[model samples]
Target: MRLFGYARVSTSQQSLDIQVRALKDAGVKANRIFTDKASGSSSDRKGLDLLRMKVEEGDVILVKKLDRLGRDTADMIQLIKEFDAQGVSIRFIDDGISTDGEMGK
Candidate 1:
């Protein structure tokens, strides 16, 4: 029943403070927040990879937005599907969307 928070930025110059703050306010603990400041166009982010490796069944993943999860819509959907297959719940706080429920389909 762990809640994992993910935050991403496009470049090193960008800070994840705002997203981190929002996620914290949304109930995610500092230890559960994963961050990556890399190009969203690529799927080679180390932090995200680490997160994928750490996630387990029934874990709830929280994102500030869909774009924070991936590059394009296809990537976003694919990532969500992967999370679903792993029995991991995905929640987008800003969009008020949850992949753990029927509304996601």
Candidate 2:
């Protein structure tokens, strides 16, 4: 199974270094970490789109936090739903959240 990562910063002023470092420490390669400078509510996350295309059934995705995935609770939930449907597992580093088991639901 391949390991992947996603990181985002809402504005250019914010640095993606921290998240990138965290992902790297979590075993994600620098080249495999997808990043975006866009709002969570925006559906035009190019990095995420590319990551989605590259992911497969057994791939695992890592994120620094739950908020890194969406603008709000509902949006985050929906995003996870999509990942679940694709049989992709997501683990949030800081949040200690995972979609790998029934307890996660």
Candidate 3:
């Protein structure tokens, strides 16, 4: 099972240390963590796109929070559905929610 973590910040001045630390503490490896310092509302998130491309079936995508993955609820839900269709799982560590679980509701 390949587990991946994603960390996002809104600006270059922001730090990814906290999110990275949380992901690491949750058992995700440094090499598997992808960081993006860009607007959540932007469609040009290269790190996120790269992550989506790298993920395969049975892979788990980890995020510190839901907003860290997307700008809005619709975007978040859409991406989760896409990952689900691809047989990939998503977990929000802070929210204690998993797309692969019954709690996704």
Candidate 4:
């Protein structure tokens, strides 16, 4: 199984190091973490596409916070749907929430 981590920066001046450290602290491997330096509101986040292609079934996608995955609930649900369909799971750090069990429909 693989464990993946994702993050985003709202602006160019923002640093993603803190979130990266959180992901690492939660057991995500350094090489498996993928981060995007752009507003999470945009759907065309480059690093996300790459990570999507790299992820396989039974993989886990982690985020320091739910907003790091998406700025809105709709996009977040869609992201979860795509991965959930492929048996991939999503986990959040700040909130004790996950899509591994009853969270998914």
Candidate 5:
């Protein structure tokens, strides 16, 4: 199962280094870490779109925080559904919080 990561920054002035660092720590490859330095949301983010297409059923999307998905909680939940539709799972690791069992639901 290959792990893919997505990082975002609201402005070009901001750094994606922090998020990228965490993803790398979780064994994600630098080449597979797609990032967007824009605001709006993940749906409108090209980096996110591109990454989604490349992800196969067994792949996992790793994010440093659930907030990395989006600011809107509802949209984030919906995004999880989309990932599920693709047969992918998302892990939000803020201090190694596991999403393995019941919580993965």
Candidate 6:
């Protein structure tokens, strides 16, 4: 089982360190964290793409907050669908939510 992490900052001035720390504390390895410094309104993130490509079945993806995964609910749900189909899971630390349980569905 692998634990991956994805973090994002709104701009270049914002820092990703805090979220990255949270992911690390949550059991994601340092090298397994993918990050982006861009507006949340856009899904054109290189890190997100890389993370999606690297994720595998039985793997878990960690994020500090729900918005860190996606600012739009529709986009988030679509991504979750893909993950679900691949048997992958996502855990939102701040939201106390996870896609590995029945309630998640």
RMSD of each candidate? 3.6, 3.7, 3.5, 3.4, 3.8, 3.4
lDDT of candidate 3 over 1-105, digit per residue (tens): 687887776544545666678778776788997877665566446656787788878988887762455655666676677778788888778665685453335
User: What is the alpha-carbon lDDT of model 5 when measured against the actual structure?
Assistant: 0.68
For candidate 5, give the lDDT of residue 42: 43
Give the per-residue lDDT of model 1 (tens digit) for 1-105.
797887776545545676678778766777887877555566446655677778888987887762545545665676677778788987778665685453445
For model 6, how does the per-residue alpha-carbon lDDT over 4-104 read when each residue is reduced to its tens digit? Answer: 98777654454577667878887788889887766566644776678777998888887666254565566666667777778888877766567545444
Candidate 1 vs candidate 5: the TM-score winner is: 1
lDDT of 4 by residue, 38-66 (tens): 65555447656676777888988877762
**TM-score against truth, every candidate:** 0.73, 0.72, 0.74, 0.75, 0.71, 0.75
RMSD of 2: 3.7
Regions more than 4 Å wrong, model 2: 10-14, 39-44, 66-68, 95-97, 100-105
Worst 10 residues of 6 by lDDT: 96-105
Clashing pairs in 1: none
lDDT (tens digit, per residue) of candidate 2 on 1-105: 777888776554654676678788877889888877664566457666787778779788887662456655665566567778898888778655675453354
Against the correct fold, how does model 3 do in TM-score? 0.74
For candidate 2, the clash count comes to 0
**lDDT tens digits, residues 31-67, model 5?**
8888766655443476567866888787888766624
Candidate 5 local Cα displacement, residue 33, angstroms: 0.6
Candidate with the larger lDDT of 5 and 6: 6
